[PDB]
Design a protein around this ligand. Structure first.
Ligand SMILES: NC(=O)c1ccc(-c2cccc(C(=O)O)c2)cc1
Length: 242
């Protein structure tokens, strides 16, 4: 079941923004959104693709564990935190594209395609460069499809090892306190219009889990913080978090 709650539209417009938030109550098996159509609108995943990319790299032995160090290749890029050594945890944290492009080249077209078919991930189309298709290739995924994929990961039901799924869920850790845990990944798609931002993941409570997927128009990088801020306004209104 899916319910549209148009009162949530204010969380976008009052931030001078436009987008969709999708929530899924795991215990009750019910979904909610401010915009049913945009909840099903398919976009480039951009850096949210680091979730499936991590899983594939781990399960094929491209990445040995969350401590293996991926050396900076010495090229100075415009994002300062990219110009250093990383492991899987910090590469996720800082959304280090060049590390994951190396992952993708080592995975290769055939294995990448097979894995995304097995994951039932979006349109399963990797057309483009093997090392940039999630940024300017043919792959597309909607917010509700992100939730489908995340629910499989949470329950260790994807067609990779349990170990691989546990490690990626560790690398997705974003916030934790006495009230909730958030495991999630941001995305920022700029190479093809429309420019958008993503935030997808879930909120762990003592007695339930709330999955979420949001995207929003992102004409400038100045609004990137709104990905989390808008989502948290929805979570607070629904009393999922204080
Ligand atoms: N102007 C830009 O092209 C640009 C590109 C990427 C980032 C970035 C880098 C690291 C983490 C995140 C993030 O959202 O978590 C975003 C910022 C700015």
């Amino acid at each position: 079941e899916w319910q549209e709650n148009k009162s949530w539209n204010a969380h976008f417009t009052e931030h001078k923004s436009q987008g969709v938030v999708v929530l899924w109550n795991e215990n009750k098996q019910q979904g909610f959104t401010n915009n049913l159509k945009r909840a099903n609108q398919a976009f480039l995943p951009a850096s949210t693709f680091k979730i499936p990319n991590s899983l594939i790299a781990l399960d094929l032995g491209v990445v040995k564990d969350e401590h293996q160090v991926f050396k900076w290749d010495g090229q100075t890029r415009d994002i300062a935190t990219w110009n250093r050594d990383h492991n899987l945890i910090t590469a996720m944290k800082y959304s280090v594209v060049p590390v994951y492009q190396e992952f993708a080249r080592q995975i290769g077209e055939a294995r990448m395609s097979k894995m995304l078919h097995a994951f039932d991930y979006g349109n399963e189309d990797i057309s483009g460069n093997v090392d940039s298709f999630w940024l300017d290739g043919g792959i597309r995924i909607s917010a509700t499809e992100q939730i489908s994929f995340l629910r499989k990961l949470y329950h260790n039901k994807l067609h990779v090892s349990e170990r691989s799924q546990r490690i990626v869920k560790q690398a997705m850790l974003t916030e934790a306190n006495g009230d909730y845990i958030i495991r999630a990944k941001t995305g920022y798609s700029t190479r093809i219009e429309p420019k958008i931002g993503w935030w997808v993941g879930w909120v762990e409570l003592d007695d339930n889990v709330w999955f979420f997927a949001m995207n929003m128009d992102m004409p400038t990088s100045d609004g990137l913080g709104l990905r989390q801020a808008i989502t948290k306004e929805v979570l607070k209104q629904e009393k999922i978090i204080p």
